[PDB]
Design a protein around this ligand. Structure first.
Ligand SMILES: *[C@H](O)[C@H](C[C@@H]1CCNC1=O)NC(=O)[C@H](CC(C)C)NC(=O)OCc1ccccc1
Ligand SMILES: *[C@H](O)[C@H](C[C@@H]1CCNC1=O)NC(=O)[C@H](CC(C)C)NC(=O)OCc1ccccc1
Lengths: 305, 305
């Protein structure tokens, strides 16, 4: 037993990480087949970041200005193009470590693993949720851009995130691997509003199911509720409205535990209205919302890759 | 910025994970050079676990009874021996993916990454501390035994933990890679006392330094204290006594932030005596103790491997 914030094994992604330098700027790129993907602001100087004209900046760059290094071996760049906010550098060698992979644009409320990298070298791995306001709460320093977020299903790596920037509130914003930002953010150094950080209700409920499965049950009570009644409480506390689709997704955990989803909702309602009175749930003193129902089932049944 | 519980990249350890079966029992082993390390209770039946005579059980086992599989390729076992609570299976092929590596017996209060595996296949990676009572708080199911804990320093993997069992309180116990349990635990299915779960004081202080660095500073106050004064509070709250060695280890973070260690101790004292009044620190509502001073410096400066 036990329940931990758990990232996927990162070995398949480690083999794809490279360093990309353009002028004085170094960041990370992702090497799959004969293409290296990286953030387009690698072409920017520190003067450019306020209001970059990426098309005008890029026309001054040729293939040989993109220095791409895999470990200690240099890659030969034979083509470059811009797709939304990413650059695609064509190299003359297919990455021999390329895993089976897909690009996916994930939905808010879903989770993924981040492999934080610097200078093309992995530093660490942790789990993130794509929050409802399309930010993530990561650990990113200068030089981490181009680090990626992914999921693994058996042997296929689903890449869903590339890191581009930090917002004023200390949260993080980035793109899918087609270069389209999650949320309204743009790749320029201006103050950008994130918007209300709504809690991922279905995920809190999954985590409560995780707790019962792993022996923490002090929060179960004698009450029930309705979706509409519960949602009147979700509103006051900036929780996402709970829908029947969410109830359906929780079905497996409801059936595993014998606790109806609405009964669990009534537990959540009381926790939101009364706090935790100084107690903990799975070692936390707040309501955790970055485990999906799949994550709970995954971890509580030992799915491997 | 940002501060997250971060595991090492797991690729170098993924390449060492194998499946070991002996009779009806399957678990994980660690393949380095021409030796596979695994928990000795792989030789046990479910009848044996109450009071196993490991020497008597093992004499009924020959090399060909240890089925060792790396991915889908079978390894040939040419020797076996027991060292404390682990078995060493000599195979006829050196693991071609063997990293530079060391075995180390880590000190209580230090952290390490766990690669949770089932059937020789990695499932996920997370960070743990070796707690003062020599338990860890992990996520381990049936079949996870032989999963390992490690640290990475540049290119060298320091293996410090092998998983063997779960205690009644839901925490986890295991050995170094020489097979010697951390703490007083033994590999038998009996109720075993863990002992008081003391908080790792130097680590909480490091995490408070992490918070200040990453912008959370509401807990700083106008007070200071002394080691002896502070420790009178550490005692009542089951914190480890703070020593000058600990102060010295915090020196770099003290110098980086300009906050004296004793001043931070006075912040901690007030938090222990007054709680957090419903506020959070680095997204947590309790005092986190599973970041070492090195972990904070590591993550706040981008060390790679
Ligand atoms: C790419 O490596 C970098 C990631 C930042 C560095 C600090 N935390 C991060 O997530 N991205 C940028 O430097 C980005 C570039 C623009 C052209 C989009 N600007 C940015 O993040 O500005 C905010 C910021 C910069 C430096 C420190 C703290 C915040
Ligand atoms: C090895 O795979 C296994 C790890 C357990 C399974 C549940 N959580 C864990 O950490 N170890 C054992 O089965 C161990 C064997 C003895 C000979 C030491 N016994 C054990 O952990 O007993 C307690 C327990 C077993 C099963 C479920 C929950 C607790």
């Amino acid at each position: 037993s036990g329940f931990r914030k758990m990232a996927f094994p990162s070995g398949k992604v480690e083999g794809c990480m490279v360093q990309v330098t353009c002028g004085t700027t170094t960041l990370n790129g992702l090497w799959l087949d004969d293409v290296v993907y990286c953030p387009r602001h690698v072409i920017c100087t520190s003067e450019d970041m306020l209001n970059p004209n990426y098309e005008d900046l890029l026309i001054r760059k040729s293939n040989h200005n993109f220095l791409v290094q895999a470990g200690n071996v240099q890659l030969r760049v034979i083509g470059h193009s811009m797709q939304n906010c990413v650059l695609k550098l064509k190299v003359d060698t297919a990455n021999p470590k390329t895993p089976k992979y897909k690009f996916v644009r994930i939905q808010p409320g879903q989770t993924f693993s981040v492999l934080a990298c610097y200078n093309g070298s992995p530093s660490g791995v942790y789990q993130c949720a794509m929050r409802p306001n399309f930010t993530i709460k990561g650990s990113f320093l200068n030089g981490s851009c181009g680090s990626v977020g992914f999921n693994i299903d058996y042997d296929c790596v689903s890449f869903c995130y590339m890191h581009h920037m930090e917002l004023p509130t200390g949260v993080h914003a980035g793109t899918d691997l087609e270069g389209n930002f999650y949320g309204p953010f743009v790749d320029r150094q201006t103050a950008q509003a994130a918007g209300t950080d709504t809690t991922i209700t279905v995920n809190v409920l999954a985590w409560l199911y995780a707790a019962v499965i792993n022996g923490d049950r002090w929060f179960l009570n004698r009450f029930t509720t309705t979706l509409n009644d519960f949602n009147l409480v979700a509103m006051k506390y900036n929780y996402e409205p709970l829908t029947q689709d969410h109830v359906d997704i929780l079905g497996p955990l409801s059936a595993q535990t014998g606790i109806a989803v609405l009964d669990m909702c009534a537990s959540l309602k009381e926790l939101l209205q009364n706090g935790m009175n100084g107690r903990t749930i799975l070692g936390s003193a707040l309501l955790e919302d970055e485990f999906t129902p799949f994550d709970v089932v995954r971890q509580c049944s030992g799915v491997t890759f």
